[PDB]
Amino acid sequence: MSRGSSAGFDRHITIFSPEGRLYQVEYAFKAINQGGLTSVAVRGKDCAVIVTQKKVPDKLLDSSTVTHLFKITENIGCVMTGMTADSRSQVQRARYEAANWKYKYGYEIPVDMLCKRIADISQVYTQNAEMRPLGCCMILIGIDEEQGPQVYKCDPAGYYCGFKATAAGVKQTESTSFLEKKVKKKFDWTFEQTVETAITCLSTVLSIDFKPSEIEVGVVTVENPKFRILTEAEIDAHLVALAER
Amino acid sequence: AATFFGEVVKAPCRAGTEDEEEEEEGRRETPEDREVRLQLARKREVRLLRRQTKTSLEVSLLEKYPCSKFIIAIGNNAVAFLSSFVMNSGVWEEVGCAKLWNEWCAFCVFYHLKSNPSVFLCQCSCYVAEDQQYQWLEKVFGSCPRKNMQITILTCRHVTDYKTSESTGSLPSPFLRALKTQNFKDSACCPLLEQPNIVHDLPAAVLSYCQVWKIPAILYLCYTDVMKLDLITVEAFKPILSTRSLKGLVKNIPQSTEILKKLMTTNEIQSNIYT
Amino acid sequence: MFLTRSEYDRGVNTFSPEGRLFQVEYAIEAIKLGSTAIGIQTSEGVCLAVEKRITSPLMEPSSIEKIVEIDAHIGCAMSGLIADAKTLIDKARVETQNHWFTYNETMTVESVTQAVSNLALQFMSRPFGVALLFGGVDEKGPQLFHMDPSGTFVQCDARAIGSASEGAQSSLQEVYHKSMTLKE
Amino acid sequence: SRRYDSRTTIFSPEGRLYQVEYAMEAIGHAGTCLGILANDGVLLAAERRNIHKLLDEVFFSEKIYKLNEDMACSVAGITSDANVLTNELRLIAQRYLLQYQEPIPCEQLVTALCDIKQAYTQFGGKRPFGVSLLYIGWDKHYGFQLYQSDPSGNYGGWKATCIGNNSAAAVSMLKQDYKEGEMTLKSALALAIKVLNKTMDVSKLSAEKVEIATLTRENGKTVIRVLKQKEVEQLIKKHEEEEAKAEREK
Amino acid sequence: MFRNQYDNDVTVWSPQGRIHQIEYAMEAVKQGSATVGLKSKTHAVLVALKRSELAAHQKKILHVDNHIGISIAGLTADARLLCNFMRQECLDSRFVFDRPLPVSRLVSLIGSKTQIPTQRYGRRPYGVGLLIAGYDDMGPHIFQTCPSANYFDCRAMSIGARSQSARTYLERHMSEFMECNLNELVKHGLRALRETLPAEQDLTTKNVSIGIVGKDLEFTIYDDDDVSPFLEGLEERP
Amino acid sequence: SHPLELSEKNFQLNQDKMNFSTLRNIQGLFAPLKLQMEFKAVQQVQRLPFLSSSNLSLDVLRGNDETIGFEDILNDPSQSEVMGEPHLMVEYKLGLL
Amino acid sequence: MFVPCGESAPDLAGFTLLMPAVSVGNVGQLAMDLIISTLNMSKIGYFYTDCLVPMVGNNPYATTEGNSTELSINAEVYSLPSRKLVALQLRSIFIKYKSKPFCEKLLSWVKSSGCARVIVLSSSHSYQRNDLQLRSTPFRYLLTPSMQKSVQNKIKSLNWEEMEKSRCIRIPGGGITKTLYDESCSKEIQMAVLLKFVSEGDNIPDALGLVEYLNEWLQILKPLSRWKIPSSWRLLFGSGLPPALF
Amino acid sequence: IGTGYDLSASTFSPDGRVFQVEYAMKAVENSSTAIGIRCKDGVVFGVEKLVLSKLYEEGSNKRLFNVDRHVGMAVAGLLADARSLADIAREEASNFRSNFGYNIPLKHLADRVAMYVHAYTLYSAVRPFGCSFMLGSYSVNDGAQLYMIDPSGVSYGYWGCAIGKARQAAKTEIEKLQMKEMTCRDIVKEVAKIIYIVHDEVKDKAFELELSWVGELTNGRHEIVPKDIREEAEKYAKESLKE
Amino acid sequence: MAERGYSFSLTTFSPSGKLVQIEYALAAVAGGAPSVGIKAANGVVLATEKKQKSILYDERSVHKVEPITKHIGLVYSGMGPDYRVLVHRARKLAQQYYLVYQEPIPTAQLVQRVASVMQEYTQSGGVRPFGVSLLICGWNEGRPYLFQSDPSGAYFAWKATAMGKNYVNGKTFLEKRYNEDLELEDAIHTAILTLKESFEGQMTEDNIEVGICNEAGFRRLTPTEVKDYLAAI
């Protein structure tokens, strides 16, 4: 940096440790957890899904302005878990890079390739001494011509990977385990079934049998490859059906 | 603290413990290494000598010649006040002057009244280094602390040095504070310092010496927005004169303050780094 | 109730609690480490003199150090560091050459010291360890100046700088009078 | 010192850069490369340090990279540094062979990479390129030469020298048993095995744990010629035959 | 004592939650000498208390353009930089738009100029406050700037050394100033400057520059014995 | 010489400039600022001028990692055939020349 | 040396010396301030020496306006003979090639005074720290070979970790601590060198945790408001912001 | 704490916190409160503005900068940095009215300048902005909108948050109040009242509070509350502290 | 001693002449995902362990064994981000080489160029080394080739090697096993068994990945092929 690097193994990102660790990327994973919410994605036959429990602590804070569900293009969503400013900034970067890809070629960025791009941008942040990771966990969904629903997650440390269910944030690992056993006994989940799994994973690990305004369901289908999040009525009807059966 | 983009750099210390570890080393106690810091030791000493004998003086001034008061001044403005008020009258024959070097420094001259060899004076317009301050107390005080000697320490401080709930600019451009010793049975005159407030350097060295050997001493601390020859600072050393500590030493304030007019108009060649 | 080792005096950018940039004043101590240079502006011109502090009778006294010419009317007397003097002599000399190659006029002494304080005041990554003393008789008439570490200039009638800056400026205070001749 | 030992811009009270002296220490811990300038040529004998049973060699030489027709170098120190430095040695030589159509005279090429390595001390934020290289050479000016370069840029010329491990030791053995003017490449290759065998304790210089390259001149063409396994097997068994003959003599 | 760690950069915060090196630049105003600046409805006056007689002529009051100038209290490298910048702003306003530059606007330009350093590494706050006195269509102006990037509009002010004395005078007679002449307003400024001075010292047409712009008046720096006529009328420190 | 001379000389300049214009106008002032601060940081990490440098961080931040041009594959600067003095080359980059 | 604030020097035999061994960001000195103010350790006098940089003030711990009068000294020392404790107090930075003199003076003084099981409160760095030590508790001890067997066994019944001996002990931070323990071992005077691994700036949590570490072992409080502070613990980021800002 | 991890903005702490931004949130706190309650009819602002000198010519030390026409702002922490982000917002909205042609959405202005604050909270060298600000707009087609932008650089809208000093005090008095079927003037009385409540005359000096608003009253363009109405609100405020 | 000043900075040498950030980037390698390169008669195998062994993972996404040109690929132990950007570069330089010399880049040549990236990233200050090592294999000139590039940028030809975890144990087992004449039908089994030494669980097409070079060129083995090799051993 201008001020420079920092004497100590966990004090700068361009200093390796005796064991061979970079520790400020591990504290960017602590910044995922500092977020204070859990996200769960669920891939299926027809749909990819991304649900997250909701918080808006201040009555005054208009609840319409406060979400973790964004889109990058029409066809491809994300949900975030981690620090608000950094997550909005990573969403904005994904838009620039999706548009760059499309400008360069004339067909839109794949989910996996946008995740790869953001992971390479993160790799550069973590190799350079001026910049730091964006402490935010982007979980892209979207339908691919060939490969169908694509549930992929990209990290502050800058590792990208594909999944058939993802969980990130606070209960990250608890919900990963929930989803392992759901997916172990998967029933080629359609729109309903994927959203059910995702909602109720968060409603198990956080233990919050939600109201429609205590979750946020983003979801895309082969039917409607436009990424499109639920209304209060729709996400309510889901929870009501999970309570009924 | 990086000379190139991404230099592994460490913080400045409050304790200088890495410097204590450098002490340990002594540059791996190498013969040339220890020799050249002993060349720096004989560079960075004090050397009490008077220029009537034109020799050097050995042990004491205060146990060598009689001491009844000993009137200290630690700063331009402190020595300007003793030049102005105490020594508008009297001979104050020189017996001593600490001859020292440090990076920053400037005279350290000792006197005592001809009428009363009893009553004593110092003018330290220079700075004495942290290592040389105990050497300075091993010169003028020497050994055999009396506890029969009113050590009237005056010192010039910066307004900013003072700890307070208001800002350092919100403080009044001048004031002075005291800190006086268990023994010292006369007025603080000014308010004594606050609990958070501390002193260090030679004035502290003198008052701390005095306290451990239970001697009457007082440390007047002129927390003024200037650190350079100023009428207001030396007339905020005023209060000292109208206490026991400096009562039989001051004379004729009209004479004194016309002499202070002179002190101000002595002037500098002051550098062109502010206008 | 504890003593701290806080340093504002290693960095030229770093302000003391009082608001002092110490490294500039440590470069003023480097002017004082250099050689005394006495200039006296008069009604009938401006003089610069300066000590060479020649040490050995092996070093060549015939050679000229410590004083320079910049155009026809202006030169300056350097004092502090000759290595640092050089780069500000070059500024003055090239920018007044350029004045004569632009306007066909030789640049005023105040304007040459402006040009020099543009090459200075730019910390070179340290407060310039030279004071120059710009004595010219321009269009306007005789003029002495003084430059310092901080980079700025200021106008003079009688100035002594260097080794005995204030030792020799107090002599000037008694000696110089407004109606000085250049001979005087 | 504990200070003045960081940035390779920061002098000591003495006037020492300890950074650059630690780059010399990094040569200290490297493959012994023993060069012996001769009459007939100039040889570049070595310790072939890395000789693991699974480790493969798909290269022409191990530590010995050739520069142009008329020059070659060796490597003792930091391996990655050396790779880029030995690519740079070829490219320097070729630019002179592009402008003046001559194979670079030897001093020029050594000096060129020394200026590179002297920048890599001068400018702080760079690391002192921690390699020494022993340059066997022929040129039209100075017949055959041996050279050295250092991380500092400090470079020399030699009748016999060493870099790497037991290097001062090896130079002592050369100063005993080298005879400037009498020393044919034959007797230099003999001295080379001798001194390697005497300075390091590798069975009886195992022929896959040494390597030589002989820069000679044949029909007015410079011939940079690696010694075969066979041929250093011949030099070492003959050294050992002489050792045994002398053991019978004593 | 803990502020130690966080006081030695301008681009680090403290646990306490304040940058101390900006506050230290705002102490470096005080290392320079006491400039007064006060205005009426006709004129905007400045005065400057000039700290040898032969050496260090000390040009505290500086002229920026016809309609505008300043007086200087603190770091003089920075004083120069800031003044020279303002000269360019006004040059360009009279080169393109062929008008004066508003004083408010020009002090805002200096504001943002002096914020860049504080929010940048390798930089320090311009260590000087100005008293930026112009005249516009609006009327007369004084505009205190601080070593910190924030700045004020004023009808009277003093900045520099033991300058509270002046500030106090300028509050006591604040009302007078609005409806004063050129020379009345000046004597008021000089009596603030004289309140700063010790009682043993005085103005004595020596440590007086006076930098007045106004309605037809351009910013004119009365110095040496062009200040004598203003100090003729002023009388009785009491 | 040729029209294309300068069109190619300042090709990259007068593209990333256009990228920053687009981002200013759509995303906001912040978006150029952020990209700029990344680029300048990762091109304060290369070799000294006189050695040919592989700036993997800057290239992948531009998206050049997976894209070749004539820039790459003509007039090979990595086998440059014309180099100066190491020290004087570095001075030029510092701005001492 | 030790000089009393009264006529005679109190007898400190059957006691423990506790210390601040001037360390990284005055962690050991702020720790010793808590203890002197909480146990109400009362001045026996001054460990007056040429080794600390001289300073004065008022009594840090000035609960009353009669205690406000009393004068601070670079090297103070206190006692609670109820608990046979003495608490040395260092208010100061150290002088170069004077730190080992001080260590010698103190170990000689405490051996001659009679105080047997010496203690230190110090600190080493939280950087230049092993991955294991970064992963573990910050708080270490370091008890001398001489130190009593019973109380060594007590330290292992508190299940503490001992200062890593990168070799030959190191105390990376703690300037006089390292040399004092080395000399304590040479003396065969008993000492227990308690420390924390710390970063610098705000070192009150460090102090409070390190006196809780002291209290876990020596039970100078009931092993568990807890710690009174000095009255001088005020304006501890200096004076207030000026009005212009914020 | 994180006292090893609060020396640059490019560091995280053991539990993934940056402390530069949290001390830029200590920075906003240092400054006296600025409140403002989104009404049914546009927005109102008040601010606890602490007049420093009487010398300073009324207009000085402003807390209520008017970014654009449709929008104006209410600031705390540093005034330097508040004006910096006022000028960012001003420029953002100006070039939006050049590009798209029409008044920038308050939401979009707010997000833009929040991401600009975030740009300064990433890169070690530069420090975060030492302040929060609160944009507020009315349109006839859009309605009342309030957006509040942190020293860290986030953007959520509110119905009446505060920034600065006694700003949880203010928050709790704004949710002791309804602002849903209330107009400019109704709320401007309550806003004066809440500045009065939250202000401390024991700690702070003479406060010349400033009341602004936007709404149908103003013609969806930010104005300063007329002396008459502001003085009647400040009378109501004095009387509600008397009661 | 601690000597920690030297072990933070990558531009420093140590008192004894060590480069310690290199060693700690090789410590990042030596806490990696076990890989085994066995250059056999009929081509090389790069049989490796997957850092996922999960119920939740898309098989088609992530590959330890990536091609660079047809005939080359490589496998890694240490860092995934770092690996991925290094092989984006590798592919570039192969295609640059094929636009300059119109010759499919030799395995040796490519290895030099990607290890010259590694060279720069230990050289300069205000960067870190890459914490990943690369078994860059491939087939040229009727010959199999395997190499091993490092964090430092030192590269060496291999007949048989291993990296990552229990990787010295890897090379011990593989010194006992590998024959010079061992052909690739038997080297894939040998590399599977070298993984078994350095494995934690039950080994399946999921929990390892394999990818091989040949006469033909480089590919990755299908899950089917990998489990069939595990069924055959």
Please indicate whether, in this complex, the C-beta atoms of B5 and A2 are within 8 angstroms of each other. yes
Close Cβ partners of B229 (under 8 Å, ≥ 6 residues apart)? B76, B77, B80, B263, B264, B266
**Six-digit token pair at G225?**
């408001």
Q: Which residue among F46, F65, F72 sits closest to I85, beta carbon to beta carbon?
A: F65
Tell me, what DSSP letter sits at residue H16?
S
Domain that holds residue C67: 9-184
Beta bridge partners of A238: none
* Buried b or exposed e, range H65-98, using 16+ CB within 10 angstroms: bbbbbbbbbbbbbbbbbbbbbbbbbbbbbeebee
Chain I hits for F45, CB-CB cut-off 8 Å, are 124, 126-127
Phi and psi at residue E3, to the nearest 5°: -55, -25
* C44 within 8 A of C95, measured Cβ to Cβ: no
G125 interaction partners in chain A (CB closer than 8 Å):
8
Q: At what angle do helices H227-242 and H184-198 cross, to 10 degrees?
A: 50
Distance from CA of residue G244 to its chain's centroid?
A: 41
Cβ-contact B96, B52 below 8 angstroms: no
- What is the CB neighbour count within 10 angstroms for residue D16? 13
CB contact under 8 A, E24 and C121: no
Return the HEC string of chain E: CCHHHHCCCCCCCCCCCCCHHHHHHHHHCCCCCCEEEEECCCEEEEEECCCCCCCCCCCCEEEEECCEEEEEEEEHHHHHHHHHHHHHHHHHHHHHHCCCCCHHHHHHHHHHHCCCHHHCCCCCCCCEEEECEEEECCEECECEECCCCCECCECEEEECCCCHHHHHHHHHCHHHHHCCCHHHHHHHHHHHHHHHCCCCCCCCCCCCEEEEEECCCCCEEECCCCCHHHHCCCCCCC
Q: Is I98 on the interface with A (CB under 8 A)?
A: no
- Calpha distance H164→H32 (Å, rounded): 5
Resolved by: cryo-EM
Nearest CA among G188, F47, A76 for reference residue D123: F47
CB contact F21 to H (< 8 Å): no
d(C-alpha D132, C-alpha G38), whole Å: 65
- Lookup: tokens for B89: 């009258």
Q: Are strands G197-198 and I208-209 parallel, antiparallel or unpaired?
A: unpaired
Torsion of CA H103, H106, H110, H113, to 10 degrees: 10
Q: How many angstroms separate the CA atoms of B116 and H126, rounded?
A: 65
* Of the partner residues C19, C150, C176, the one whose CB lies closest to the CB of residue E24: C19
Block residue for tokens 């530059």: E101
Contact indicator for B23, G98 with CB cutoff of 8 Å: yes
* Residues in CB range of I160: below 8 A, 6 or more apart: D54, I37, I38, I39, I171, I174, I175, I177, I178, I190
Question: Is G241–E146 a contact, with Cβ atoms under 8 angstroms apart?
Answer: no
Q: What angle do CA F34, F40, F46 make, to 5 degrees?
A: 145
Search chain A and give the residue with CA nearest E9: A3
Half-sphere exposure of F28 (CA within 13 A, CB side): 26
Helix (H) or strand (E) holding D136: strand D136-138
In which residue are the tokens 């613990």 written?
G233
Among D24, D25, D56, whose Cβ lies nearest the Cβ of I39? D56
Q: What is the CA radius of gyration of chain G?
A: 18
Per the listing, tokens 């106690």 go with: B29
Q: How far apart are CA A187 and CA F15, in angstroms?
A: 50
Hey, how many other C-beta atoms are within 10 angstroms of the C-beta on D247? 8
Residue type, position I101, single letter: Y
- As for how many domains chain I has, the answer is 1
Give the integer Cα–Cα distance in Å for E188 and E210: 12
Query: Chain I contacts of B6, Cβ < 8 Å?
Result: 125-127
Cβ-Cβ pairs closer than 8 A, B with G, add up to 161
Q: Look-up: residue for tokens 């001194």?
A: D195
User: CA nearest D139: which of D98, D110, D113, D180?
Assistant: D110
Give the separation between CA H222 and CA H207, rounded to whole angstroms: 23
Closest CA relative to residue B205, chosen from B111, B134, B258: B134
CA-wise closest residue to E8 among G184, A97, B14: B14
Quote the minimal CA–CA distance from I126 to chain G in Å: 19
Reference A212, options A234, A227, A193; nearest CA is: A234
Q: Tell me which chain G residues have a C-beta less than 8 angstroms from the C-beta of I5.
A: 128
Chain breaks in chain B (C to N over 2.5 A) after: 105
Of the candidates F24, F34, F41, which has its C-beta nearest H119's C-beta?
A: F34
Positive or negative: CA dihedral D174, D175, D179, D181 = positive
Q: Hey, which CATH number is domain H1-240, 3.60.20.10, 3.30.70.980, 3.40.50.300, 3.40.50.150?
A: 3.60.20.10
* C-alpha to C-alpha distance for D207 and D229, rounded to whole angstroms: 6
CB contact under 8 A, I1 and G128: no
Report the largest interatomic distance among the alpha carbons of chain I, rounded to a whole angstrom. 55
Cβ atoms I132, I29 nearer than 8 A: yes
H and E: helices and strands count for chain H: 6, 8
| CB spacing of A164 vs I58 below 8 angstroms | yes
| Topology, domain E4-235 | Glutamine Phosphoribosylpyrophosphate, subunit 1, domain 1 (3.60.20)
Domain that holds residue I179: 4-233
Mark yes or no for CB contact I11/D23 under 8 Å. no
A10, G134: Cβ pair inside 8 Å?
yes
CA distance C3 to chain G (A): 5
Q: Which residues of G127-165 are buried (b: 16+ CB within 10 A; e: fewer)?
A: bbbbbebbeeebbbbbbbeebeeeeeeebeeeebeebbe
CB C166 within 8 A of CB B268: yes
Are G238 and E3 spatial neighbours (Cβ–Cβ below 8 Å)? yes
Is F70 buried (19+), middle (13-18) or exposed (0-12) by CB count in 10 A? exposed
The two structure tokens encoding residue H73 = 């702002």
Q: Across the interface, which of A1, A96, A131 has its CB nearest the CB of F31?
A: A96
> Hey, CA dihedral for C169, C170, C176, C178, is it positive or negative?
positive
10 Å CB burial of residue G77 (0-12, 13-18, 19+) is: buried
Residue of A10, A12, A24, A26 to mutate, interface with G, max G Cβ within 10 Å: A10
Beta bridge partners of E36: E47, E158
Residue of B nearest to A129 (CA): B6
User: Helix G204-218 vs helix G27-38: angle between axes, to the nearest 10 degrees?
Assistant: 60
Where do breaks (C to N over 2.5 Å) occur in chain D, by preceding residue number? Answer: none
Question: How many contiguous H segments (helices) and E segments (strands) does chain F have?
Answer: 6, 0
**Could you give the angle at which helices E103-113 and H79-99 cross, rounded to 10 degrees?**
110
Which positions in chain B touch C153 (Cβ < 8 Å)?
Answer: 272
CATH number of the structural domain D1-248: 3.60.20.10
CA distance A54 to A230: 13
Q: Which two tokens stand for residue D102?
A: 């001559």
Put simply, the answer to whether A21 touches G131 (Cβ < 8 Å) is: yes
Q: Which residue of F has its CA nearest to A98?
A: F63
Shortest CA distance from B8: residue in chain A? A5
Q: Which residues are within 8 A (CB) of A126 and not within 5 positions of it... i.e. 6 or more apart?
A: A13, A22, A24, A25, A133, A157, A158, I81
- Return left, alpha or beta for G97; rule: phi > 0 is left, psi -120 to 50 is alpha, else beta: left
* D161-163/D155-158 β-pairing: unpaired
Contacts of G126 in chain A (CB under 8 A): 8
Strand-pairing partners, residue D146, are D136, D158
Q: Which residue is listed with tokens 């001992």? A: G162
User: DSSP labels for chain B?
Assistant: --SSTT--B-PPPSS-HHHHHHHHHHHHH-HHHHHHHHHHHHHSS-----TTTTS---S-STTTTT-SEEEEEESHHHHHHHHHTGGGSS--EEEEE-----TT---EEEEE-SS-TTSEEEEE-S---TTHHHHHHTTTT-SS--S-SEEEEEEEEEGGGS--SS-TTTS-S---BB-B-SS--S---SPBPPSS--EESHHHHHHHHHHHTT--EEEEEEEES--SS-HHHHTSSHHHHTSGGGTTT---HHHHHHHHHHHHHH-----SSB-
Q: Are G178 and G169 in contact (CB under 8 A)?
A: yes
H90, H67 Cβ separation under 8 angstroms: yes
Q: Are C23 and C15 in contact (CB under 8 A)?
A: no
Do residues A49 and I162 lie in contact, with contact meaning Cβ atoms separated by under 8 Å?
A: no
Provide the residue type at I18 as one letter: K
Q: Determine contact, residues I49/I199, Cβ cutoff 8 Å.
A: yes
C-alpha distance from D5 to closest chain B C-alpha (Å): 13
**Angstrom distance (rounded) from CA D12 to CA B32:** 14
Chain B: residue nearest D125 by CA?
Answer: B4
What is the domain count for chain C? 1
3-state secondary structure of I208: strand
Determine the distance from the C-alpha atom of residue D63 to the mean position of all C-alpha atoms in its chain, rounded to a whole number.
Answer: 9
- CB contact at 8 A, B173 and E197: no
Which sign, positive or negative, has the C-alpha torsion E5, E8, E12, E15?
positive
Measured in whole angstroms, the distance separating CA E182 from the mean position of its chain's CA atoms is: 18
Report CB contact under 8 Å: A9, G131.
yes
Cα separation of D33 and D49, whole Å? 10
Structure tokens at D119: 């920048």
C-alpha B74/C-alpha B219 separation (Å) is 10
Nearest residue, CB atoms, D7 vs list B3, B27, B36: B3
- Please give the Cα distance from A90 to A78 (Å, whole number): 10
Q: Which residues contact C83 (CB under 8 A, 6 or more apart)?
A: none
Q: Give the one of D7, D13, D125 whose C-beta lies nearest to B5's C-beta.
A: D125
Among candidates E129, E112, E106, E115, which has minimal Cα distance to E25? E129
Q: How far apart are CA A84 and CA H150, in angstroms?
A: 11
Position D28, amino acid: G
Structure resolution, Å: 3.0
Q: Are H115 and H129 in contact (CB under 8 A)?
A: no
Q: How many other C-beta atoms lie within 10 A of the C-beta of residue G37?
A: 20
The candidate with the shortest Cα–Cα distance to F92, out of F47, F40, F49, F43, is F49
Neighbours of chain D (3+ CB pairs under 8 A): B, F, I
Examine chains E and I and say if they touch (3+ CB pairs below 8 A).
Answer: no
Which uninterrupted H or E stretch holds C148?
none
Q: Which of residues 79-138 of G touch A (CB under 8 A)?
A: 125-131, 134
Domains in chain A and their CATH numbers? 2-245 (3.60.20.10)
With CB atoms and an 8 Å threshold, state whether G127 touches H27. no
Q: Which residue has the tokens 């050249």?
A: B36
Q: From CA E23, how far away is CA H78, in angstroms rounded? A: 12
